[PDB]
Design a protein around this ligand. Structure first.
Ligand SMILES: *[C@@H]1O[C@H](CO)[C@@H](O)[C@H](O)[C@H]1NC(C)=O
Ligand SMILES: *[C@@H]1O[C@H](CO)[C@@H](O)[C@H](O)[C@H]1NC(C)=O
Ligand SMILES: *[C@@H]1O[C@H](CO)[C@@H](O)[C@H](O)[C@H]1NC(C)=O
Lengths: 116, 116
């Protein structure tokens, strides 16, 4: 058997201001038990961008039907991009606990935003 | 996500020997409880956890009566049960968080005590 991989296939993505950004991420395994979350930046001051909990991220949703058990695609769409959204975005796998712990991070995707 | 059949609140009086706080997942697809994690939270603390992979329940000493019926998890039922002593001194908002493999979700229920 092989280790879980978190795959962000795109090193960078360019989006025109006002458009929606698509950030890709897939996993190779659904165990160990625990969620996938997206952040902008890394380290202690990183910003939570998405998880599967209802009603928290009005700009962000999954591209694929992530309500299915077999889903391995964690790609997200972010609406209404402005220059303020520029940065490196990480797809991160957690394991459950009190509290949950980071298990494995994807490589990151740099979002650049094109002005007017 | 795991999706929930939501309940705004449940109420009890002096007449209740125990209480149940309902939590029902509507798209559960688990084959074994090893695939499942449950956390019930109150004022930001985990007051009950079930780690399926270890078949291990954990409560703090001030919620010593808190439990779920582990056999019902495969049907999507993660309802919390506790005795009236733990209930009457801990009224307020409870969060039920369920994880199955990589899918997660949560829902909130207010536990209300009516004085008669
Ligand atoms: C629609 O809303 C979702 C968030 O729910 C967002 O991710 C997506 O980009 C929006 N679509 C468009 C075309 O703006
Ligand atoms: C308390 O008891 C009543 C009457 O049997 C019941 O309908 C209600 O659901 C109970 N409340 C809780 C919170 O368990
Ligand atoms: C669930 O899986 C565990 C680990 O293989 C096993 O010990 C347990 O018996 C399984 N549950 C049932 C009802 O067989």
């Amino acid at each position: 058997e092989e280790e879980l991989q978190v795959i962000q296939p795109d090193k960078s993505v360019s989006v025109a201001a006002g458009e929606s950004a698509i950030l890709h991420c897939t996993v190779t395994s659904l165990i160990p038990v625990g969620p996938i979350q997206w952040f902008r930046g890394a380290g202690p001051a990183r910003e939570l961008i998405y998880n599967q909990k209802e009603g928290h991220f009005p700009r962000v949703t999954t591209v694929s039907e992530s309500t299915k058990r077999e889903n391995m695609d964690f790609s997200i769409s972010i609406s209404n991009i402005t220059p303020a959204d520029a940065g490196t975005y990480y797809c991160v796998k957690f394991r459950k606990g009190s509290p949950d712990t980071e298990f494995k991070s994807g490589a990151g995707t740099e979002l650049s935003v094109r002005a007017k | 996500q795991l999706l929930f059949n939501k309940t705004k609140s449940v109420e009890f009086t002096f007449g209740n020997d125990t209480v149940v706080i309902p939590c029902f997942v509507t798209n559960m697809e688990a084959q074994n409880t090893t695939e499942v994690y449950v956390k019930w939270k109150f004022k930001g603390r985990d007051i009950y956890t079930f780690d399926g992979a270890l078949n291990k329940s954990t409560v703090p000493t001030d919620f010593s009566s808190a439990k779920i019926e582990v056999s019902q998890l495969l049907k999507g039922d993660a309802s919390l049960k506790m005795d009236k002593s733990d209930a009457v001194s801990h009224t307020g908002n409870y969060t039920c968080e369920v994880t199955e493999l990589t899918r997660e979700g949560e829902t909130i229920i207010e536990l209300k005590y009516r004085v008669v």
